[PDB]
A paper describes a structure:
The unprecedentedly high resolutions of the F-[name] reconstructions allowed for the modelling of hundreds of solvent molecules and we accordingly observed clear densities for the nucleotide and the associated [name]+ ion with its coordinating water molecules. The overall conformations of all [name]+-F-[name] structures are highly similar, with a Cα atom root-mean square deviation of <0.6 Å and no changes in helical rise and twist, indicating that the differences are in the details (see below). In the [name]+-ADP-Pi state, the cleaved Pi moiety is separated from ADP by at least 2.9 Å, indicating that ADP and Pi do not form a covalent bond. After ATP hydrolysis, Q137 in the nucleotide-binding pocket moves upward by about 0.4 Å in the ADP-Pi state so that it resides within 3.1 Å of Pi. This upward movement of Q137 triggers a sequence of small movements in the SD1; the proline-rich loop (residues 108–112) moves slightly forward and triggers the relocation of the E107–R116 salt bridge, which allows the penultimate residue C374 to flip into a hydrophobic pocket, permitting R116 to interact with the carboxylate group of the C-terminal residue F375. Altogether, these changes result in a compact, folded C-terminal helix, which then unfolds again when Q137 moves downward after Pi release. In [name]+-ADP-Pi F-[name], the C terminus forms a compact, folded α-helix and the D-loop is predominantly closed, whereas the [name]+-ADP-F-[name] structure resembles the extended C terminus and closed D-loop conformation of the [name]+-ADP-BeF3− state. Our structures show that BeF3− and Pi make hydrogen-bonding interactions with S14 of SD1; and the backbones of G158 and V159 of the SD3. Thus, the γ-phosphate moiety forms a bridge between the two subdomains, which is absent in the ADP state. However, the S14–G74 hydrogen bond is intact and the back door is closed in our 2.2 Å structures of both the ADP-Pi and ADP states of [name]+-F-[name] and Ca2+-F-[name].
Numbering used by the authors:
A (entry chain A), B (entry chain C), C (entry chain E), D (entry chain D), E (entry chain B): 6 to 45, 49 to 375
The structure:
């Protein structure tokens, strides 16, 4: 049986191929103590253990914007995933890994070298995350908008063919929305500065933030009453109240200039990706907008995407956003489907063909 | 029962002798994927299946200007015709094939070798397309103007005798008009460049183009108003509007200098063919101008031919253009009539006389 | 009842003795297809059927200058005459045939062998054409000038006696005038070259040509105006105009040097024939010039003959040209009179006396 | 000194009387630009200048079948001949022109009117081309077969007397052979359609075509091997190979039915011309068959003519074909001899006698 | 004196006719501030001023693929060109403008309306860019391959005549190569996303990119060593190193499938354009391949074009690429030559004839 490990910038989703949900879901964090130990305590903490002790830790994400920046810490996370969360021996399970498109080549080359030389897996494979999301939805045609913690990317696929020249990638996702919410919470006098407090702000975002259908009408509503204001209790019992910050934070996805980015919002990027595709496949792409990832879980985002793309596309086109309730795990679920296919068993990169080609084998066997 | 297969440059018309319409009509195209397959898809697509997936295919016509240029792809089309469209075993049906006059000898020699050695037909026959059009009209006398996708040819026939020295052939037909319409659509800012977009332009032509009775008066009318402008919705919902391009594209048939050809238009070519015939048969040829093929289906082309030839011929001659409503299938219908005649059953090239003479038997048994 | 068949070089005149006009008059031509048959058509065409399809035929005259040169084709014409035009069984009708004087002996010997062994006539007879013309006019004395398509001959007859030493024969008649008109029509740019176009020129001659009373005064008139120019519409609607060719073509009869012949014109030949006769019969011959045949049908030819012979003969002689309006059929009409005479019923060559003497019986029973 | 200008359908041969070769030989063509001029180029090009720029020109022959059909273009060619090729003033040189026999009268009438009123020559003369060929050979007796680009004609001459009734003319010559070679080159897939490509085909003919001694034995040889196949490099570097087309194209001269003509071949036409002559001159005509013109330059044509006429003539007659190596210029060389004769200086049509008679003077002073 | 303004998709080249180099060369960009102004700054920046402040601007090209898409911004660029770079009054200088072939009609109609109604020029003219390149090389014959920032086009010209049916246009040029280099620089971890960073990538391309003579041998060389790797210092002092990206970016010109285009490379397009021309001009076109524009400035592109076309053309043809060192300004230099010709002074569209015909005068006076 194969292991499916979706290493996001934010969460690790790991499990066994054939299952319908990841067995292990924990934050992709390494924490190290930043204070003085006085009682006669590990040197670092991974995952949920780092989250429960974050008050005395400095928390580091080894993956930023889909790119592994700390390889020593990433190896701690993979080690924790295999031996503590799944409790398997990696040397007997083929491992399917995931990646964002348009990543640096050295990223998946080092993932291959570590899987084969540190964990000694028998076979591995690196899939593109948006492609796995289309497996999860049971489709062969559609434009996938995957947005997690690090990357937002669009991959148009038609009858199982990717249009790589139409792939869009935007380094604006959940972690940038968390940083923006931290910044605009200072307007109400709430100061979150440490890495542990950034975890509190992320939890505020996941519970209170939503996408306004019309942003300017929502700003006028929040300015005329308090029907939109909600409260949130902090870990120490302090209660904070937020109003228009609830929809200003997700609005950055549609207006990246809020955080100083020049790029277009996710609706324009989806439309630009479709318009780069051949005219004869555009109608099928308009009807099959698949959303996946945690950053697509905001209340009202599919209705907003529907409205924004409808305004860009021709009036005769039927725009349909496919936002399944389980789309937070679509990449893992699709990787579980793929790794269980009998047609896929020839696609693995085995340890034998890695020894005769080195880590560059991953560039000619994986899309 | 015999198979009648009219292999045009543009369409395959195939069916059974005795019927009144082809059973299978599909585009004579082979499509191959030009993008990267990512989901775990055939290697090539033929006919209507290539048309429905043309967004991700590069489309190739194996026949250009009546001449088969890709014999591997032509065999895919014949295989698709026999086994998928008609669903017959070719080894038990005599097969009537069609050809344009003044084709290279090797073209019908290779058609014979493939019918007898790849499909193992019991008997076959290659007829001239314009002759079959005269069978379809129930005549034995007339000058046939057949214009399809590849070839425009004139064959004068009198009392069942062809005048081969008066046969005219012009490599200017539907596909050259499609290419010209693509070129003049750039004047309005519409860019069609790929082979899939050429299929869209062909559909625009078949719906909006017509033959002006007086070209220069029509150009002045289109320049003074918008009564001639029509709209067309593209596959992706974009609406394009065209005005004088509607009649400028078919005008190339009467003025081949629009596409840089030195030859005369179809009206002068018809007249030159009649003037090469003996003076005593010209009056019967003037009264029996038979038009066939898809390129004669433009609205107003028989009225324009009538007016153009009347101006070339003597004033006492009665010019009559026979343009039946079913003339798009005249070659197939005439081949269906011919293959059902009891007098024709001695004309087949049987497998026995092919084995004692080789593929060159086709040159002494078929006109 | 007897059959009367006048086989001219140009026309067949056939009918029944006792009638006053031939029942069947058709061209003495055999046509064979010279093009490629493509529709699934006889091997040869005779008579009026060859004339209506002459555009695709090569036309052959089996009789040239009164002499049958193609015996297979002549038998097709006789077969067509008996079974298709007259619709009789030749084996029950005595057949009167005609011939020009001074023909080869083998010509009428083969006519006898074919009538008795191919058509099995009960009796036959070969008459001289000029003698039959004198029966048609009701005379027993006169010099007959018979001119058809092949031969012009003079036969002086006095009180029912022929003067055979005074018989003149000139191989210059209608077909040579047609060939000359074809040649001089090239002066105006009209090109008639094929055998079908020779039939068109013959029709021009029969409608527009006439005999000038004074040739040199007519040439000066045609050169000073256009009062003599006439138009003629060709079968394909082209209109041709001819001026002095109208009387230059018949002038060859009076000046055979126009076509390179050394012989004298028909007026000198008539006079030379009379001057070979005995002096005591010349006065009756001068008063009884009988003209017959199609080549004597030109407007103005009797007036020209009258003027030419008057200038040759003594001033005291009364020259009279007998040119009846029906003289185109005089040979047939006279043969109809002869074959109906009760005195002629002993003159037939019966099948019984042909079996005991062979085909040479015709030389001792027919003049 | 006199100018000798032989205006063929294909080439202009011009020079000075007394010389032994034409000074100017160039194609009788007028070219006009058929494309759009973009750089800031004459309106028409004549002769060799039209040949070097034929890629962007439409080429017109003003003479077709010996008859000048475009008088404006013919005047450009004469103007180019006098002022650019010979560089003379025509108003001081008597000009000998040539013509085919049996041409329209208006052709040489307009040549006379243009020479006297446009170029103001002092005197001119129109000779028959075949007669000049007999001057070139130094004979007074012989039957001349002249075949150029437009006309094939036979003129029998005996002791300086022409037999005009025996003159044959056939509108089948070099240009019809070029058109036929273009047609049968399509059997191998070579398409020559434009007027510039017709010039390429003419060059192929002049280098590769020959006359087979026995046509049917040559067809069997070409079908059993490749010893007859030759290659030819096109102007753009493409190499074409032709086999039996090399002798099928000249075979049309002996079998005009290849191009749909009903007439007899040049061997039968030569024999028919001799048989129209008086019996006492035929033996001298059989021994003096003079061939001239470019269409008699095929390798093997004199041997084929010798064999064909020997089979038609009586076995006791000595058939001799006189085919000199310089017979391509025989008409010009003979016209140079004639215009230099002291006996010819009374034969010119002077400007004085043209003013008192008009252009019709040419019909009573020139044969 | 005339103004010559070559408005490319990338650069403005402007100057005075008669000069040998453009006086003003600046980027065809409009920049607008995208940040918040805090110090108490224009609303937009044009040209080199937009390039020096691009850190705080969003940069827009008003011309895309040779077509002006933002007419307000294009008018800012023309205004900046006249009044700030050249420092002239446009109302006293005739202005020669340039355009790519096969542009929309409305593009040059709006250029004419703006020149006459906004800048009030006395006269103007719109030339085709490839034609001006042939003026710059001093030729009248040649096939021009012009490739700038927006368009690659081929125009074959022979003796000053364009063959418009053989004009090829490909919307793949410098800006598409810059976008592709941006995409493949992500393989090494370099992220350029903003419009200002696209200007940095364009500068990398112009300094480090070259055309490999053999692409697959170059890919093997770059994979076996580091002899091809070069460094580049970014504006902020960061040093980037690139290896095979140096020749993969220009390889898109020969393999447009790298960016998902179905079209053929520039070598096949040049050959297809020549093969659409008449066979008699192809040899002169093969010897006169003129390259112009900034996208032909890659090291090794003429050697690669020479090798690619040699492999397509017949072995006997002499392929010669004319790539002058100043070909980056060939369109301007040729327009300077043209606007100085005395023959061109009648070709201007004057303000007088614009008032009587409207902006559509440009379609009947300019090619
Ligand atoms: N209900 C929610 N509403 C808004 N954002 C959410 C929600 N749940 C998760 N997220 C955000 O999704 C991001 C990552 O989710 P995931 O799809 O697992 O991405 P990754 O694969 O990068 O770990 C996190 O930044 C988190 O804040
Ligand atoms: N209604 C129409 N108007 C104009 N053109 C048409 C129409 N229908 C078909 N055609 C053209 O006819 C051409 C071929 O038709 P067809 O007679 O089947 O030719 P072929 O035998 O070469 O396939 C195509 O190029 C198509 O564009
Ligand atoms: N009206 C006419 N004028 C002049 N020639 C005529 C006329 N009618 C017939 N002919 C000519 O008479 C010739 C033969 O007529 P006919 O007396 O029947 O001769 P034959 O007996 O040889 O057939 C033909 O060549 C025809 O051209
Ligand atoms: N060597 C050759 N072999 C065959 N044909 C030739 C040759 N040379 C010339 N011709 C043909 O001769 C024809 C005309 O030659 P020429 O005698 O000058 O005729 P004209 O007088 O009509 O110009 C041309 O059609 C040319 O193709
Ligand atoms: N040395 C060089 N190497 C490669 N590309 C270049 C070079 N110089 C300029 N270019 C490219 O040429 C393109 C435009 O140049 P130019 O010929 O001025 O085109 P335009 O007329 O469209 O402005 C730009 O995209 C630029 O990147
Ligand atoms: Mg993810
Ligand atoms: Mg067809
Ligand atoms: Mg008669
Ligand atoms: Mg000649
Ligand atoms: Mg440019």
């Amino acid at each position: 049986t194969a292991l499916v490990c979706d290493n996001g910038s934010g969460l690790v989703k790991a499990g066994f191929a054939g299952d319908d949900a990841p067995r292990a879901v924990f934050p992709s964090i390494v924490g190290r103590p930043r204070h003085q130990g006085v009682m006669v305590q590990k040197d670092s903490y991974v995952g949920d253990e780092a989250q429960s002790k974050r008050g005395i830790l400095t928390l580091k994400y080894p993956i930023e914007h889909g790119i592994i920046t700390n390889w020593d810490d990433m190896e701690k996370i993979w080690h924790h995933t295999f031996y503590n969360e799944l409790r398997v021996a990696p040397e007997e399970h083929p491992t399917l890994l995931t990646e964002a498109p348009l990543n640096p080549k050295a990223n998946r080359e080092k993932m291959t070298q570590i899987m084969f030389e540190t964990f000694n897996v028998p076979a591995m494979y690196v899939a593109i995350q948006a492609v796995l999301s289309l497996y999860a939805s049971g489709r062969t045609t559609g434009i996938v908008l995957d947005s997690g913690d690090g990357v937002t990317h669009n991959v148009p696929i038609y009858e199982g063919y990717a249009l790589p020249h139409a792939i869009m990638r935007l380094d604006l996702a959940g972690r940038d929305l968390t940083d923006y919410l931290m910044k605009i919470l200072t307007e109400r006098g709430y100061s979150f500065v440490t890495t542990a407090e950034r975890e509190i702000v992320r939890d505020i975002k996941e519970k209170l933030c939503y996408v306004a259908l019309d942003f300017e009408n929502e700003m006028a509503t929040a300015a005329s009453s308090s029907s939109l204001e909600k409260s949130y209790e902090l870990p120490d019992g302090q209660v904070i109240t937020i109003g228009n910050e609830r929809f200003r934070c997700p609005e950055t996805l549609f207006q990246p200039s809020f955080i100083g980015m020049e790029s277009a919002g996710i609706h324009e990027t989806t439309y630009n990706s479709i318009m780069k595709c051949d005219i004869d496949i555009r109608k099928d792409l308009y009807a099959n907008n698949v959303m996946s990832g945690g950053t697509t879980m905001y209340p009202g985002i599919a209705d907003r995407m529907q409205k924004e793309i409808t305004a860009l596309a021709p009036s005769t086109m039927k725009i349909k956003i496919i936002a399944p309730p389980e789309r937070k795990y679509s990449v893992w679920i699709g990787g579980s489907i793929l790794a269980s296919l009998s047609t896929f068993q020839q696609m693995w990169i085995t340890k034998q063909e890695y020894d005769e080609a080195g880590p560059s084998i991953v560039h000619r066997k994986c899309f």
